[model samples]
Target: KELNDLEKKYNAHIGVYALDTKSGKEVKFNSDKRFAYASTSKAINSAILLEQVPYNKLNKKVHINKDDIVAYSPILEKYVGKDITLKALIEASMTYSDNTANNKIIKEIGGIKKVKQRLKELGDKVTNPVRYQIELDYYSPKSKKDTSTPAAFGKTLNKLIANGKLSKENKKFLLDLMLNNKSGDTLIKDGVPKDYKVADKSGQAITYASRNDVAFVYPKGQSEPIVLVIFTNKDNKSDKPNDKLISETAKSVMKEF
Candidate 1:
């Protein structure tokens, strides 16, 4: 009821899902509805890259060119002609949400088709992949391309992060990258208490923007932490409202748990 009220006040669809693994407590509002998942998907894409190539193959090279440049590519533009490893791409892609780094990894691992198949196999039934970062970055709620439900995204997080398939080393790298992510400090990270740990990714799509933050939140001394997926759509270009909405969603749900 509170979450629904929030949606009307914000004039945006708010999809929230929280799962406490140890307690088996589930809280949700519009969690089944699909919303655009922007750069938040980079976490999974980086995991897929680790699966395809071992840590020993971190030296795999990516040299950026005409096809590499796109919106929000801070790390790639500087090193256009220089050589950078896959490890660097994965780091910049997940930690900084670098667009070009992710696109290069996508190109290396094949394309959106392969990502779709892998995600399906990972038990993400409601998220659909359609285009690369180039077209998908243009956020439009009318279009379903690259949209995901809160609950469905939780499924992916469970399969890939909690009871994960990646090796211990790979999983450590992914989680550490998320834990140190600077983009989410004001989103879910701000909502939770400072003592509680969060390994999260926050995303914003261009124009008519949508804000998303998906996280594995750990309470102090808990063996397995709860998972939170908060998706908000139709915020203005300004970050204030959308950022607060996502953080507020986290506070409301965590209070219940």
Candidate 2:
């Protein structure tokens, strides 16, 4: 298959799990292998926080200390001294993949332990979230970082959308945030038709050793959407091929529907 050939050509491990919402048709390719989750962990984090704190509490002001500082986080820098709402921080974390915003939320929810527990309770046994955003080191041994299988994380999204686990309003809010994500337009979204709507999250390591995109594709004028996930990683660092693999994989998945 094209996916298998692309995996060999890129010299990267790849995982895919695509679900057709209406027909319940599913596809898989190395979907159970664990890979560094990068900023994709924020999606799991968002699920936990939204459940623990009420929407009104999300707007409550909180101080941002210097300890929250991290690279790739201009949004948090802007609010360092002044008080900022939890909702604002989450928006920055999810939409822009801001490290400080993610860490702050991690800190607020009592760290990675609680996040992992929440995921497990939500039926995700394969995801292991071990550190804060800036603390992650992709070059380190894979066991030291956050990890998840494509099938496990894809199930997370499916539950959020299907199981009535969240209220209609909250589900819409989260989905909207993903749909309007400020970054990651080049991966899965790039391969999709211009008119289709997509709600997605993307992740990449600083060393460019790993890149991933997970999304729900809403075909134009259709009520049912398709769930798609692609994760790629290589032993050596190379951004170009890993990224190309994701885009090409996405194009292939779309062609089937």
Candidate 3:
């Protein structure tokens, strides 16, 4: 596999690996160890609901205070709604990177401890989500933090897509939801051709300067699936360029296939 030169220009410790869904052929650029998953944990949160609560039963609705929406914190002070459905909340949590939506799911899913238990049961031990969900405080310059690796997250994704591991309906729901993820302007989707249908999630937490993304893409007709996870940390504050690096890296790698 050829490495992308732009990654070195930006000085990113990037890692990406693709697993063939049909034949088990594996391709790698640099996929080893772990990286902080940022908001990507919401995918796990979604899985928990599917496992613990039935698909129909998961539709429990709840009211939304002004703080329940994305950017509800200082990011968006002027917007607030009366109530929202569980489906809406989860969708917002995944797509818009809503902090309130994530925290809501965290509480509904029985806190960080329970979520981690679910992760461990699924054969993943590399995830340590210290808090219930991604919060503004956690990203504050002074706050305790949690982390996860691409390898661990990649395996987690593979398990989620496996039929027997999770109900077929639930797996489809997850994949569909991921395909609509609305946040993070980095890897995978950013690099791929606009017509390509890529299912993925993006993450970022800058308190320590970290940006990460994990995506599974199936070319047209669902030929063979490729899964790629990238984790990067920029020791400095100017981290915006990392997104471009990630997008280009993924584009370069996928073009080879």
Candidate 4:
């Protein structure tokens, strides 16, 4: 009901999924299919790092290599440390949607191939993680890009925080990192109650092209928190309309939930 209303309100071809974390009750639509993943892919990168390096070890000194340099993103302006830790990389990757930080983590994780290898091992059928962090220009006819399904990406997040794949300490670290995300909340977070803790991430391919938000919602002490992943893409208008519409839709959904 909520999904149908949201789709009608925005005229959006939205693919969504909501899962009860404790009981695992799920409501889904095209959950296993692929769409443009946007920045939600960073969570995948962050999780892989948690599995590879000890949370504490990531805090130790590590240099900002060339891989950390994102040529076009606004995030490059704020990276001040000469020797940044892996933890910093993950933080920037998740919190600020720092492209360079994401790329840096990509390098540290031994490139996208390793990310895919790990994904397969986890029993997720998603394809190559190489396109997990592609640049906007990479989607041009001259270059080949990648895509991901809403459910696949959301499931990646679910396993990361809820499945005990990462240590409790590390999971908390990841959640804490995401709790600070500032990119796309204007849509999903706009409707939740002020006291609720919405630990989530949002992604967009082009400011107005493709939009997506995925998060674990713990409304006050609601133990049966729901994992909601919403995806949208506007045909021609600016992201403003997309933002406004998504926010309104979010409000309606929150009320329904």
Number of the top TM-score candidate: 1
Residue 11 lDDT in candidate 1: 76
Task: Please tell me which predicted candidate would have the highest lDDT against the true structure.
Answer: 1
For residues 1-257, could you state the per-residue lDDT of candidate 1 as single tens digits?
A: 27887787777778888888888788888889888788888887888888878777888886878657877788887887787899999998998788889888887778888888888888776788777675666666577778899999987877777876778788888889989998898888988887889999887676565789999999877868798999888656443445877777787788887
lDDT of 3: 0.67
Find the 10 residues in a row with the least total lDDT in model 3: 70-79
Which residue segments of model 1 deviate by more than 4 Å?
235-240
lDDT, candidate 3, 68-123, per-residue tens? 44443332223355555676666767776667877777778888888888879878
Better of 2 and 3 by lDDT: 2
- RMSD per candidate (Å) reads 2.2, 2.2, 3.7, 3.3
C-alpha lDDT of all candidate models, in order: 0.82, 0.78, 0.67, 0.68
For model 3, state the Cα shift of residue 12 in Å. Answer: 1.5
| Better-scoring candidate (lDDT), 1 or 3 | 1
> For candidate 2, lDDT tens digit of each residue in 1-257?
38889878787778898888888888888899877778877776776677677765678778988877898896998877788888898888888888888888887887878877777877888877777766563633336357788888888777766553666666677789999985768889887888888888888765547788888899887878898988778776545444667878888878777
* Candidate 4 off by > 4 Å: 72-81, 132-145, 236-241, 252-257
Off by over 4 Å in 3: 63-83, 133-145, 162-165, 182-186
Superior by TM-score: candidate 3 or candidate 4:
4
